[PDB]
Each structure stands twice: as C-alpha cells, then as structure tokens.
Amino acid sequence: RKLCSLDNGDCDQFCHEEQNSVVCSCARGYTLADNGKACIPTGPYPCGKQTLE
Numbered sequence: 836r837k838l839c840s841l842d843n844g845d846c847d848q849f850c851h852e853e854q855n856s857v858v859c860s861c862a863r864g865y866t867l868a869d870n871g872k873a874c875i876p877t878g879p880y881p882c883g884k885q886t887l888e
Contacts, residue, residue, distance in 0.1 A: 838856065846874075848874045
C-alpha cells in the first residue's frame with residue numbers, strides 16, 4: 836500500500852500513479868479542486884449523487 840493503493844492516494848475519485856507519485860482526476864461534471872485531490876461539482880445534479888432536493 837504505497838501510492839494509489841494507500842487509501843486511493845487520498846483522492847476523491849480517480850487515482851493514477853504517474854511516474855511514481857499520485858495524480859487525481861474527476862468524472863465528467865466535476866473539477867479537480869485546488870488541493871489536486873477533491874472533486875468539485877460543476878452543475879446542480881452532478882453524476883453519482885443521490886438527490887436531496
């Protein structure tokens with residue numbers, strides 16, 4: 836358990852070890868946050884989210 840094998844590399848969604856070291860990415864409709872880890876929704880109904888309203 837090193838990079839992406841160690842807690843998804845701390846990413847919210849997609850994780851990839853690019854030449855050693857983690858690189859996170861997000862599904863369509865989300866944008867990688869400043870931390871380069873969190874995934875921020877673009878619209879009101881982002882994919883994969885249960886609706887609370």
